[PDB]
Amino acid sequence: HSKKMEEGITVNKFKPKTPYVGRCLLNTKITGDDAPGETWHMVFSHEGEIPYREGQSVGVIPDGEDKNGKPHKLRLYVIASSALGDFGDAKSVSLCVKRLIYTNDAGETIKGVCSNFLCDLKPGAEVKLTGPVGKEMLMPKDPNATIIMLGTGTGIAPFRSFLWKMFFEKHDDYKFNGLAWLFLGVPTSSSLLYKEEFEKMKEKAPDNFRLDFAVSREQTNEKGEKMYIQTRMAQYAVELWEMLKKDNTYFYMCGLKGMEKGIDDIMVSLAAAEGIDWIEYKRQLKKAEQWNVEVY
Numbered sequence: 001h002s003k004k005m006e007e008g009i010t011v012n013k014f015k016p017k018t019p020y021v022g023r024c025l026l027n028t029k030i031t032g033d034d035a036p037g038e039t040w041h042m043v044f045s046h047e048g049e050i051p052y053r054e055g056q057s058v059g060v061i062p063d064g065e066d067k068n069g070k071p072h073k074l075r076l077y078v079i080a081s082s083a084l085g086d087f088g089d090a091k092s093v094s095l096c097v098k099r100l101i102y103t104n105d106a107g108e109t110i111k112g113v114c115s116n117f118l119c120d121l122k123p124g125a126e127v128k129l130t131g132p133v134g135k136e137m138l139m140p141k142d143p144n145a146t147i148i149m150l151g152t153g154t155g156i157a158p159f160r161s162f163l164w165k166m167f168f169e170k171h172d173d174y175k176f177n178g179l180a181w182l183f184l185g186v187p188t189s190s191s192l193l194y195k196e197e198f199e200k201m202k203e204k205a206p207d208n209f210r211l212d213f214a215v216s217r218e219q220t221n222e223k224g225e226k227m228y229i230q231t232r233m234a235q236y237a238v239e240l241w242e243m244l245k246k247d248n249t250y251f252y253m254c255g256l257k258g259m260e261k262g263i264d265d266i267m268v269s270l271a272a273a274e275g276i277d278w279i280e281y282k283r284q285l286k287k288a289e290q291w292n293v294e295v296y
């Protein structure tokens with residue numbers, strides 16, 4: 001009995017031993033020069049062979065071999081495009097990828113294998129994909145659901161997917177009429193992903209969509225605290241907590257593993273105030289398909 005759009009999903013049509021080979025159509029930097037680190041939005045052609053649904057992931061196998069002459073292991077990317085895709089024909093797939101660069105123990109700079117291969121792709125290059133993967137982040141079946149989305153960085157991906165479906169497409173069997181609420185936590189104004197798309201949706205469905213940004217390094221609360229995602233939510237605690245109390249409210253969280261803790265910290269307090277144990281409540285929410293998380 002799912003509350004999510006699980007019926008007829010496709011999973012692992014394509015596997016690492018037998019990946020689908022698509023081609024890169026577009027690759028754009030989506031962050032400003034200021035921004036700490038780059039995020040790219042890239043679109044691949046799949047000719048309709050990968051029948052994915054909003055909320056799913058695909059695996060990518062970066063070209064080359066590991067230190068043992070074996071092919072690289074796949075990396076997971078949550079799909080950033082809705083099922084029809086950015087061109088609305090259901091034959092392309094889009095990714096939101098942050099370029100990973102670090103320094104090892106010896107002070108040597110290291111590039112992440114898969115993120116660099118991807119961010120480097122040129123239109124026309126081929127790419128090996130697997131999947132689609134996932135059920136965890138599927139959308140609720142209920143077109144009148146209250147949908148709360150908390151993403152950090154690249155974690156915006158699945159929410160972009162949902163939103164496109166909700167507000168930029170006409171579907172024969174789906175018409176969103178609830179309230180969607182997005183909170184996006186980024187470090188800088190130059191790291192605000194797809195804001196322009198979101199501003200157009202806001203205009204379009206002003207009573208159905210709520211939008212809040214948290215730019216850590218540029219925003220503070222009254223206390224003078226950094227504007228983290230929880231820091232921004234805290235400002236709506238009464239509301240959100242009230243929202244959590246209703247059966248038709250679904251929470252989705254995506255992004256950096258770190259985010260989980262600070263939200264649980266806020267939650268723990270709100271609930272206790274009311275005589276509720278957050279740890280148990282959450283578990284029930286999870287069981288009810290109301291508290292959905294994918295962080296990494």
Ligand SMILES: Cc1cc2nc3c(=O)[nH]c(=O)nc-3n(C[C@H](O)[C@H](O)[C@H](O)COP(=O)(O)OP(=O)(O)OC[C@H]3O[C@@H](n4cnc5c(N)ncnc54)[C@H](O)[C@@H]3O)c2cc1C
Nearest residue numbers: 075076077078096097098100102112113114115116154296
């Ligand atoms: C379910 C899921 C969804 C994801 N969705 C996306 C997405 O939508 N967008 C996206 O960009 N990523 C996403 N990721 C992350 C992505 O899968 C890759 O792991 C990421 O792009 C880096 O892989 P790479 O091959 O570039 O790095 P690799 O070459 O594999 O380097 C990985 C290793 O880097 C090391 N490392 C990282 N930072 C440091 C540091 N500061 N110091 C020392 N060591 C360090 C760690 O040991 C780590 O295991 C997702 C991951 C998962 C599991």
